[PDB]
């Protein structure tokens, strides 16, 4: 690393600094004073003080990226968001008066909720002890399941049975299915929670 150990990662939060000195506790006051002496790394290309910044969508874009092509990854992500928004508007205009109160048209809400509906609570760990591999259950950290939701979504949308359907249209359809607790990714979550229930005795091995 070209940064020395002294350098600390920057805090881009714009509302943090505007917090009044009166609201500062003694501990937070000490942290603020300490940070002044410290060296800070240059903020990286990416996150910004922009009010539209969404770390989850940035991570999803980074995980769709291939070969450093971030322009194409972001183009695909924005096309997916636009397709989701247009499909929801189309479904909203064709709805009855009472059905229009339960149709979500905000694409960010749909994306976050879809990625929440695919997170597995428990997982499996391959562990060979007796000369035979044993898949023991384990509860996943929050980071691990948050990563797994995105990885499963991307892998499902890259499956080759989806033939000549361009990526944005596939991804919007998968997101809208997962929004309603349907589709192959929710099935992949359920079939993991079932293979981790059919091995609840091997947990003791861990």
């Amino acid at each position: 690393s070209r940064y020395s150990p002294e350098f600390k990662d920057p805090l881009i939060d714009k509302e943090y600094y505007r917090k009044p000195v009166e609201e500062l506790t003694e501990e937070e006051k000490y942290v603020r004073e300490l940070k002044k002496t410290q060296l800070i790394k240059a903020a990286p290309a990416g996150k910004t003080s922009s009010v539209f910044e969404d770390p989850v969508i940035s991570k999803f874009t980074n995980m769709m990226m291939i070969g450093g092509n971030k322009v194409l990854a972001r183009s695909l992500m924005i096309q997916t968001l636009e397709a989701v928004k247009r499909k929801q508007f189309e479904k909203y205009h064709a709805a009855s008066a009472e059905e229009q109160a339960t149709i979500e048209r905000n694409p960010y809400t749909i994306f976050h909720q879809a990625l929440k509906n695919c997170e597995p609570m428990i997982g499996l760990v391959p562990i060979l002890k007796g000369g035979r591999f044993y898949q023991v259950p384990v509860p996943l950290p929050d980071r691990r399941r948050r990563f797994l939701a995105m990885k499963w979504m991307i892998t499902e949308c890259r499956d080759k049975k989806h033939q000549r359907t361009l990526m944005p249209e596939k991804l919007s359809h998968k997101l809208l299915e997962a929004f309603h607790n349907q589709g192959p990714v929710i099935k992949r979550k359920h079939d993991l929670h079932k293979m981790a229930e059919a091995n609840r005795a091997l947990a003791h091995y861990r």
Binding site: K14, K35, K36, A42, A45, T48
Partner: protein
């Protein structure tokens, strides 16, 4: 605090670790009390410098163009891209990159995000005019070099507290990450 070996040099006597700690505890106890001028000089005898300038970023001086408009110039570098920005005290948010409007120079939305970051952080969007010249590098390197130059130039027209806030956000630090051999 004076470190053990140079304390030995000052005393011209070899001394252990524990007695060094005892001396330093006495010095701290003296510092806590309402030490006077002579006492502060005595304590200063046993303290070298590590520099407090990490606190303070250097503020550029405000210059004046022939029309009488106040402005400030600064420079930045990212990978091989090198940028020099001129920020005018009063403006309407017009950024000119190499004599071209910024949205025409930077088609990609991300670079425009990068140019937006410094002014947006201090809530001064639409309140300055920028005339920058960048050279070398690629799209993102040029965007980052411009962003650093505008941050350094904008340091002149904000409060010292906002200068520190920009420093803590990583907006005034050259990024040293470059291609390895």
């Amino acid at each position: 605090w004076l470190i053990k070996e140079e304390l030995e040099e000052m005393l011209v006597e070899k001394l252990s670790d524990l007695d060094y700690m005892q001396f330093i505890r006495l010095l701290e106890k003296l510092l806590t009390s309402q030490c006077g001028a002579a006492e502060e000089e005595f304590v200063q005898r046993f303290r070298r410098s590590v520099t407090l300038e990490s606190k303070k970023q250097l503020i550029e001086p405000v210059q004046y163009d022939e029309q009488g408009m106040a402005f400030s110039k600064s420079e930045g570098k990212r990978k091989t891209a090198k940028a020099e920005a001129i920020v005018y005290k009063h403006g309407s948010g017009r950024i000119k990159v190499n004599g071209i409007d910024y949205q025409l120079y930077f088609p990609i939305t991300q670079d425009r995000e990068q140019l937006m970051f410094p002014f947006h952080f201090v809530d001064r969007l639409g309140k300055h005019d920028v005339t920058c010249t960048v050279s070398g590098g690629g799209r993102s390197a040029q965007a980052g070099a411009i962003r650093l130059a505008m941050a350094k130039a904008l340091c002149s027209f904000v409060t010292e507290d906002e200068v520190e806030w920009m420093r803590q956000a990583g907006l005034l630090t050259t990024d040293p990450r470059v291609r390895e051999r």
